[PDB]
Amino acid sequence: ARSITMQQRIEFGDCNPAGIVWYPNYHRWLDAASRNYFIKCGLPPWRQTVVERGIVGTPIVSCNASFVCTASYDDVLTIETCIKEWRRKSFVQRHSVSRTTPGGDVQLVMRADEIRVFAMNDGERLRAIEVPADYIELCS
Amino acid sequence: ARSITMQQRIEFGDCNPAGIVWYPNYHRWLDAASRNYFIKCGLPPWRQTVVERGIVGTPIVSCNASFVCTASYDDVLTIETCIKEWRRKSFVQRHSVSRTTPGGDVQLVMRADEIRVFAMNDGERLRAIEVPADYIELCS
Amino acid sequence: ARSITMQQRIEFGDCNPAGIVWYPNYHRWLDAASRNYFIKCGLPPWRQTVVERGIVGTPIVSCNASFVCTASYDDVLTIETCIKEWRRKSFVQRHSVSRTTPGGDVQLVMRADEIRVFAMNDGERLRAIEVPADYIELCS
Amino acid sequence: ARSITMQQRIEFGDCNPAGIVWYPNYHRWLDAASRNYFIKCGLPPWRQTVVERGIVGTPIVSCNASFVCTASYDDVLTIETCIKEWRRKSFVQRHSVSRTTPGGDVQLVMRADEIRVFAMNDGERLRAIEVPADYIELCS
Ligand SMILES: CC(C)(COP(=O)(O)OP(=O)(O)OC[C@H]1O[C@@H](n2cnc3c(N)ncnc32)[C@H](O)[C@@H]1OP(=O)(O)O)[C@@H](O)C(=O)NCCC(=O)NCCSC(=O)c1ccc(O)cc1
Ligand SMILES: CC(C)(COP(=O)(O)OP(=O)(O)OC[C@H]1O[C@@H](n2cnc3c(N)ncnc32)[C@H](O)[C@@H]1OP(=O)(O)O)[C@@H](O)C(=O)NCCC(=O)NCCSC(=O)c1ccc(O)cc1
Numbered sequence: 001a002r003s004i005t006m007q008q009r010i011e012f013g014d015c016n017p018a019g020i021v022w023y024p025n026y027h028r029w030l031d032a033a034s035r036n037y038f039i040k041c042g043l044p045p046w047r048q049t050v051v052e053r054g055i056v057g058t059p060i061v062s063c064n065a066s067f068v069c070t071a072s073y074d075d076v077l078t079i080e081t082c083i084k085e086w087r088r089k090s091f092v093q094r095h096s097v098s099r100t101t102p103g104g105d106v107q108l109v110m111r112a113d114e115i116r117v118f119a120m121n122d123g124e125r126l127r128a129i130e131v132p133a134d135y136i137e138l139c140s
Numbered sequence: 141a142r143s144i145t146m147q148q149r150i151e152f153g154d155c156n157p158a159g160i161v162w163y164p165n166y167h168r169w170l171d172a173a174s175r176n177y178f179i180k181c182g183l184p185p186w187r188q189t190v191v192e193r194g195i196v197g198t199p200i201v202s203c204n205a206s207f208v209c210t211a212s213y214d215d216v217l218t219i220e221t222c223i224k225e226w227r228r229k230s231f232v233q234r235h236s237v238s239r240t241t242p243g244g245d246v247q248l249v250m251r252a253d254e255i256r257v258f259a260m261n262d263g264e265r266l267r268a269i270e271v272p273a274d275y276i277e278l279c280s
Numbered sequence: 281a282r283s284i285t286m287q288q289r290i291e292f293g294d295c296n297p298a299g300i301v302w303y304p305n306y307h308r309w310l311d312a313a314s315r316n317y318f319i320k321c322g323l324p325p326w327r328q329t330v331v332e333r334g335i336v337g338t339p340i341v342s343c344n345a346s347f348v349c350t351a352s353y354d355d356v357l358t359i360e361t362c363i364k365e366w367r368r369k370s371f372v373q374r375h376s377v378s379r380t381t382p383g384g385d386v387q388l389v390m391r392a393d394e395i396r397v398f399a400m401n402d403g404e405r406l407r408a409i410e411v412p413a414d415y416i417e418l419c420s
Numbered sequence: 421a422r423s424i425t426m427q428q429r430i431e432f433g434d435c436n437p438a439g440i441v442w443y444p445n446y447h448r449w450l451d452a453a454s455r456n457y458f459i460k461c462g463l464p465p466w467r468q469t470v471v472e473r474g475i476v477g478t479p480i481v482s483c484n485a486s487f488v489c490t491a492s493y494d495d496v497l498t499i500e501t502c503i504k505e506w507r508r509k510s511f512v513q514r515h516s517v518s519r520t521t522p523g524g525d526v527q528l529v530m531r532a533d534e535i536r537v538f539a540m541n542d543g544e545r546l547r548a549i550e551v552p553a554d555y556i557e558l559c560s
């Protein structure tokens with residue numbers, strides 16, 4: 001479907017002693033890409049949404065992650081994001097990370113399908129909401 | 141099976157603007173717990189292993205993550221680790237995160253089954269190895 | 281003066297390819313220790329303070345950092361915190377990090393004096409306030 | 421002197437509950453900018469240097485940090501790096517972070533002078549070296 005693409009440079013800080021990306025970092029980039037998607041789709045900043053209709057953002061309730069091959073500093077990553085499926089209060093967000101070999105070949109590094117929702121904070125308690133119609137439409 | 145348990149305090153740094161743990165952090169704690177397991181099982185530090193038999197550590201090739209309920213700073217987390225299954229070159233490592241309500245009730249926060257391996261770095265290239273026998277035994 | 285002490289274990293995630301703590305992590309622990317200080321001194325959680333008298337927390341306006349010797353995973357750090365000086369709207373918070381040699385010797389790893397304040401968020405704008413009297417007193 | 425410039429986007433992950441950049445993140449970007457400088461100056465990757473002449477990288481022995489004004493997600497940062505002074509085994513690396521107001525005005529966010537060195541790892545022990553001549557020259 002509607003797919004967004006953002007790039008990400010691997011920094012020395014991002015790798016472990018074994019000298020390859022430390023995994024959590026992928027999550028950090030994913031959460032980035034995630035938001036990036038929606039922004040680039042026309043949804044206002046959370047900051048704003050929380051004031052207009054109480055949406056804080058989109059919490060992750062589930063995720064299936066897969067690490068195909070290693071990466072390291074200097075490598076530049078490409079992250080393909082798209083909405084896999086719209087459920088009721090949930091939605092599938094797929095992201096595919098890859099890197100380029102100097103041969104112009106593109107190698108899948110990692111992939112992940114994260115299941116998120118749009119939520120509100122009724123005080124201290126986080127609560128999911130029915131994916132908003134308008135949202136759908138912008139993302140379309 | 142053989143299960144290890146370690147605790148983790150949520151720091152203000154660990155939460156987002158929405159005021160709850162930022163997810164990647166869970167991964168960070170998981171990777172911690174992961175290693176903690178093996179250490180507490182008697183395997184020497186990677187540092188050492190890489191010199192004695194070239195093992196750098198245990199890279200993650202797969203993971204299924206689930207966020208049951210929110211957490212925030214000050215909360216103290218309990219992380220239950222264990223080896224779910226030994227395959228050939230792979231192994232299932234399960235971790236269950238929970239927190240305690242002042243009612244002495246324990247609430248599942250998040251869970252994850254990560255699939256890892258023991259590996260070597262043949263130069264620049266990461267390569268998995270057959271789970272080491274002795275390792276098995278210590279973990280038993 | 282009134283000094284608080286908290287410990288911190290170095291995780292594999294925390295070190296770089298060079299195999300020693302990655303510096304930013306120190307900051308993370310410092311910010312921890314920082315808050316820890318106040319909590320352990322009796323000040324309620326920010327969460328609370330922001331509702332009772334609008335204090336969000338204590339932003340850092342300045343810091344002088346010094347890295348004496350290296351650290352790495354497995355090492356356990358000890359962080360000594362105390363209020364060096366109370367100014368008007370500012371205050372000096374000193375922290376001294378050290379580790380123990382198996383000889384029972386304690387080696388200074390790193391130190392830092394961070395200058396913070398107590399603040400409010402008048403909408404989008406962050407604003408410092410006169411250190412609160414009561415606070416002083418608890419910290420005393 | 422020779423000054424390098426790199427940009428950095430603030431991600432939701434990067435901010436705290438108070439809704440502004442969490443400080444350690446600045447350090448992360450600084451360390452980035454730091455390396456970026458040298459790379460863009462023509463020095464090969466550490467990876468390489470450690471094999472050719474044993475240089476692992478450039479550890480930080482000191483830093484003076486200053487936070488002028490707040491930043492938050494979405495903001496795009498500009499980081500100006502340059503070598504302030506070459507000492508013997510040390511060197512001053514200055515970085516100036518700023519952001520742009522929609523008025524086309526540029527506002528200093530934060531600054532820092534970090535004192536680094538070029539080092540080697542004689543086994544487990546980190547040791548500084550005399551800034552390398554050639555390096556100087558490239559950076560010039
Ligand atoms: C979000 C929740 C409150 C939702 O609970 P509820 O309000 O009671 O409603 P529901 O249970 O019906 O959940 C709504 C949907 O999620 C689905 N869901 C819930 N759990 C699952 C799992 N495990 N798998 C698949 N789908 C799931 C559920 O089935 C619903 O789908 P629909 O049928 O289409 O309606 C609760 O699951 C929760 O709080 N989970 C923990 C959240 C958490 O800690 N996430 C990690 C931190 S958040 C974060 O990092 C972040 C970053 C950036 C952002 O923009 C936002 C958040
Ligand atoms: C690790 C690998 C080199 C293994 O490849 P190979 O050497 O060629 O062998 P194999 O393909 O046969 O994989 C070995 C096993 O993994 C299994 N595997 C591989 N992919 C999968 C997936 N996706 N699901 C399940 N099982 C899998 C595979 O089927 C084998 O199981 P066995 O049948 O029991 O042998 C390669 O998959 C790889 O490099 N993946 C990318 C690794 C990566 O980038 N991980 C993220 C960073 S590592 C990290 O954060 C870390 C932290 C702390 C540490 O201690 C270590 C590492």
Ligand SMILES: CC(C)(COP(=O)(O)OP(=O)(O)OC[C@H]1O[C@@H](n2cnc3c(N)ncnc32)[C@H](O)[C@@H]1OP(=O)(O)O)[C@@H](O)C(=O)NCCC(=O)NCCSC(=O)c1ccc(O)cc1
Pocket residue numbers: 152311315336337338339340341342367368369370395397399406407408409436438440441442443444486487488489490491
């Ligand atoms: C905090 C500020 C709004 C204060 O500005 P103002 O409200 O206009 O008042 P002031 O300028 O008078 O500052 C108050 C005091 O700070 C002092 N100050 C300010 N800058 C400096 C520097 N550079 N050195 C020393 N002292 C300083 C100032 O001189 C005042 O001291 P007093 O004389 O005793 O009153 C503004 O400096 C600012 O926003 N700086 C940027 C803040 C920032 O981005 N910090 C990084 C992120 S915050 C963070 O990580 C965090 C973590 C955990 C928490 O609990 C809270 C925050």
Ligand SMILES: CC(C)(COP(=O)(O)OP(=O)(O)OC[C@H]1O[C@@H](n2cnc3c(N)ncnc32)[C@H](O)[C@@H]1OP(=O)(O)O)[C@@H](O)C(=O)NCCC(=O)NCCSC(=O)c1ccc(O)cc1
Pocket residue numbers: 012296298300301302303304346347348349350351451455476477478479480481482507508509510535537539546547548549
């Ligand atoms: C680096 C050191 C081994 C140097 O010690 P030595 O080899 O014995 O030599 P020296 O003491 O003479 O230090 C060399 C220079 O540093 C100077 N130095 C040392 N401490 C200071 C302080 N506090 N202020 C100013 N200058 C200092 C020293 O005076 C020398 O300058 P010259 O006179 O010009 O020679 C030791 O100070 C050390 O290990 N400090 C701790 C290092 C540390 O833990 N840094 C944090 C983690 S590293 C990191 O995050 C990183 C990221 C990215 C990278 O590329 C590299 C590293």
